[PDB]
Amino acid sequence: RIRDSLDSLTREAACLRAERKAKKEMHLRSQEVVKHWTNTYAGMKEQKLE
């Protein structure tokens, strides 16, 4: 416990960094699925502009 006490702050920072990265990556992959969907309002506006 005392040997690993010297690095207590780095794991605390690493967990926040990992959770923020995973959340934002989930947002981006769901945006990929949303942009591949076809019955959206703005996508229908783009097809009407076409």
Binding site: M26, R29, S30, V33, V34, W37, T38, N39, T40, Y41
Partner: protein, 610 residues
């Protein structure tokens, strides 16, 4: 668009109203009602032509003697009409809609020459009308209820094709004679000496000599329609226990009596003595006799159809189902052969393929709301309206535990964590509660009181970490598990019924009353798109398979809908029952789709590829 899949395995029954079961005189097919329709079953279980209509619940069935016409009444709101429908038995076509009463229709009957039908209607506005079949209209009618007596229940014609009997609801017994040229029916009353019974069933002999009445007091009354006087009293010394509910005749003079406490007795006219008695399951309300004579059928109030041989009186149950509004099927994980179906006072564990019932567990008179399995096969949890959460052993129905004062109102939705340690409950109060189980005791950790209204469904992530609470407030919360606080709220314009996760957990999908199947972004509660329901119904049950390309949707009309996931592709095979479908699940083997219709009917179709 809207390709019809296939249809199989009708399960339910309505035996709650009298004389619903009537075999037609070719003695092969049995017709019987259901929540809003009629059903015809063969010997091969060929469900045939659910005959559509009536707008609301069918309540009374009468069959023409030749075997070509069937006519069934129904029940509507106060001051609304109610329609007899004449059907066929060859090409199952709505011939005549005969809609002339007030409120509802209590009784229908046919004449032995096929020209005439008779109808009794009204709990308050009671009248009898006579219909002709040559032209789908009424001949004449009159109040079929004795003023300064009470009301009336049932009617039957003679075999003189002209005189018909209206039967005591509280002590009015009246013969009418019908004459065509005056176009009239004449009321005479059968005077009885000191007897005033509450008559509650009726049958007629073959040669019109005597007709029999079963009363609530338990004694069988024989009548004489020629003398217009009381003919014979009933038994002294062991009158039947409850009211006499189901009387049938034979070609000879041996009447078959049945009482609503579940008793069947062979009976004869001078001495009403039980020559052959068999105690059955639940209150009998229908006897129907095959025209060959030697086998017959019994319909019971608890929905059991009994094929019973006339020789030696041995029975064989052939159809069983629930007898109130059903809710919340759940498959076991890994097994596609088992069903759990829960309803008022009752839980049943089924089979899937051969449709046998394997076990049944009763709470006495309270109401169930939700059922769920464990992640393993150890226990089945259920949420009841008595303010309690129970859990039961899988076989032998042992009660492992109960939870005394869970919520303030009845606990509605219940959910299982995949590590078999935690159970999440939500109820009508809104105090969302978490239960840690153990071998010895079970305890509560923290009460999450976001909501202001009821809770519909609770569904948790594949690896527990987050959950979601579908609720009828307009807010669907995602909670986290490892800490007890809230992440995100869906605020929307729909009283929610079903909220499902996408496989691979990208998005979450909501439905409800406002008929907008809506996909939702898993962050911020940001709405993506809205795909509409059928037309002006509602939707209560969604389903996604393991992969996440199929999407099953079931609701307030008769329509179950297969959908593609990414685009809106509909596939209708919802031609089944319009009793309001409330939950629907696919088998874990991706073979069958199973839906529970509220009026008790569990139907499975085959799997289509989306």
């Amino acid at each position: 668009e809207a390709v019809e899949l296939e249809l199989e395995a009708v399960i339910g029954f309505n035996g709650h109203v009298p004389t619903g079961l009537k075999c037609h005189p070719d003695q092969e097919h049995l017709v019987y009602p259901l929540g809003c329709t009629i059903l015809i079953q063969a010997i091969n279980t060929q469900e045939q032509n659910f005959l559509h209509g009536h707008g609301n619940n069918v309540s009374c069935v009468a069959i023409s003697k030749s075997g070509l016409y069937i006519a069934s009444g129904q029940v509507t709101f106060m001051g609304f009409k109610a329609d007899i429908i004449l059907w066929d038995y060859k090409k199952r076509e709505l011939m005549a809609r005969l809609s002339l009463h007030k409120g509802k229709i209590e009784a229908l009957a046919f004449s032995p020459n096929d020209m005439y039908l008779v109808s009794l209607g009204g709990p308050d506005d009671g009248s009898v009308v006579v219909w002709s079949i040559a032209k789908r209209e009424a001949i004449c009618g009159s109040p079929a209820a004795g003023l300064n007596v009470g009301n009336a229940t049932t009617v039957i014609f003679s075999k003189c094709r002209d005189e018909m009997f209206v039967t005591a609801g509280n002590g009015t017994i009246r013969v009418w004679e019908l004459d065509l040229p005056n176009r009239k029916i004449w009321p005479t009353e059968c005077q009885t000496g000191q007897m005033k019974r509450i008559v509650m069933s009726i049958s007629m002999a073959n040669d019109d000599s005597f007709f029999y009445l079963g009363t609530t007091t338990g004694d069988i009354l024989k009548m004489n329609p020629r003398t217009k006087l009381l003919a014979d009293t009933g038994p002294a010394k062991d009158k039947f226990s409850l009211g006499v509910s189901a009387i049938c005749c034979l070609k000879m003079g041996g009447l078959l009596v049945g009482s609503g406490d579940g008793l069947l007795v062979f009976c004869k006219s001078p001495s009403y003595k039980p020559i052959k008695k068999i105690q059955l399951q639940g209150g009998i309300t229908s006897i129907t006799l095959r025209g060959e004579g030697h086998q017959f059928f019994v319909g019971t109030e608890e929905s059991h159809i009994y094929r019973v041989n006339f020789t030696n009186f041995k029975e064989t149950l052939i159809t069983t189902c629930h007898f109130e509004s059903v809710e919340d099927i759940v498959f076991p994980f890994g097994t596609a052969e088992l069903f759990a179906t829960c309803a008022k006072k009752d839980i049943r564990v089924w089979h899937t393929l051969t449709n046998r019932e394997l076990l049944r567990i009763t709470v006495p008179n309270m109401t169930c709301h939700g059922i769920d399995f464990m992640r393993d096969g150890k226990s089945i949890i259920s949420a009841w309206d008595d303010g309690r959460i129970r859990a039961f052993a899988p076989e032998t129905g042992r009660l492992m535990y109960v939870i005394n004062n869970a919520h303030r109102i009845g606990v509605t939705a219940i959910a299982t964590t995949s590590d078999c340690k935690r159970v999440i409950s939500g109820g009508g109060e809104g105090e969302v509660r978490v239960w840690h189980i153990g071998h010895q005791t079970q305890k509560l950790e923290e009460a999450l009181k976001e909501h202001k209204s009821s809770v519909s469904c609770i569904r948790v992530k594949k690896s527990n970490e987050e959950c979601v609470t579908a609720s009828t407030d307009g807010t669907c919360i995602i909670w986290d598990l490892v800490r007890l606080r809230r992440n995100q709220m869906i605020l929307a314009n729909t009283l929610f019924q079903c909220v499902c996760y996408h496989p691979e957990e990208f998005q979450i999908i909501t439905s409800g009353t406002d008929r907008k199947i809506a996909y939702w972004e898993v962050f911020d509660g940001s709405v993506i798109r809205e795909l509409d329901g059928s037309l002006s119904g509602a939707v209560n049950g969604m389903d996604i398979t393991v992969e996440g390309v199929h999407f099953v949707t079931g609701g307030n009309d008769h329509l179950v809908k297969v959908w593609d996931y990414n685009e809106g592709e509909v596939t209708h095979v919802g031609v089944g029952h319009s009793g309001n479908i409330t939950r629907i699940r696919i088998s874990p083997g991706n073979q069958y789709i199973v839906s529970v219709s509220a009026d008790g009917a569990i139907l499975r179709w085959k799997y289509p590829f989306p």
